[model samples]
Target: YDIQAWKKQCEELLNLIFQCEDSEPFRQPVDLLEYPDYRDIIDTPMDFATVRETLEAGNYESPMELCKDVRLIFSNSKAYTPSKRSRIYSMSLRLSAFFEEHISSVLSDYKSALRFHKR
Candidate 1:
């Protein structure tokens, strides 16, 4: 198996999380999974267990401390591309997918905040 190719993808995923501004997360029950591209995972749970497996044994300081878990899961599982049946795998894709929409709001919010703060 060409693990390097897979890890390279994972590296990009990690890089991706950092590329954008460290903006706010959407409120709980986000409508992100509602889109046609995300329609499939709409019913599929984000599955906290998938995130849990990636961490070391200890109590975390906050959920943010474990934010990278999902990326790690996809990396470890070597799961990528899109598929209809794989819920967990599909989620990693959504990380990027969701981020596609998420980044805009962040920029908007930042600018809006600046605008609001100005005049």
Candidate 2:
């Protein structure tokens, strides 16, 4: 495998994920807008931006902060529909796992590629 190519692809995927969060479909609620404070709940551009910046910082503290933000965003009853909240929570958890997997894979590859420099 071309490690450089894979690294580039992973970076592209990360960028795409960030971009998706900014897009209307992901940012706007299809049916939840009628609910009270739905916009304030899910339309959290500042929180999203903060989390993205923290992730880009590449530190343990950032990840912990990201996790905390994730919980804050999804776990709050005022922010989500009680009936559908569980579904949203599950989806968020799964996506968090997916993000961790991709991040770990990329970092592992980076470490392996840079190993020669240390020795």
Candidate 3:
């Protein structure tokens, strides 16, 4: 696969993510449980063990981190991940950041001003 195409996929996916985030249902104080979009909150599917958790663990990488890594991977697809499965590792980072943030919010006991993340 071409490097540019890969970048396009990641960029398009991220754009869709933000687009959904901007939607009215998800505007603010989003009640994920109240709408279908809420499915996405958990759609990424997370597992909590030794307590609740997101697959985002171990790396502690955020979406920003994933963005950087993906770009780097594109630049050196041969150096980073040079296989199809390699891309899974690439893709996992983004999903991890999403699930990680939401899962933390849901599991945290801290009093958040925007409890929607927890809700």
**CA lDDT, every prediction?**
0.39, 0.47, 0.35
> Candidate 2: which pairs clash?
none
Off by over 4 Å in 2: 1-11, 19-48, 54-85
Model 1: pairs clashing at backbone N, Cα or C within 3 Å: none
TM-score of 1: 0.26
Q: Judge candidate 2 against the unseen true structure and give its global Cα lDDT, from 0 to 1.
A: 0.47
Put down candidate 3 lDDT per residue, 1-119, tens digits, no spaces.
12123233334444454444322222233244654453443323221121112112434223334444433323332333346566535553554456445434322322242254446
lDDT of 1 by residue, 1-119 (tens): 22123233333434555443331121122244444444343333232333333333344332333444443433432223245456544545555465445444433544465556576
Q: Candidate 1 — worst ten consecutive residues by lDDT sum?
A: 21-30
Clashes of each: 0, 0, 1
Model 1 alpha-carbon miss at residue 89, Å: 4.9
C-alpha TM-score for every candidate? 0.26, 0.39, 0.23
Clashes of 1: 0
Q: Which candidate number has the best TM-score?
A: 2
Candidates ranked by lDDT: 2, 1, 3
Shift in Å, residue 47, candidate 1: 6.3
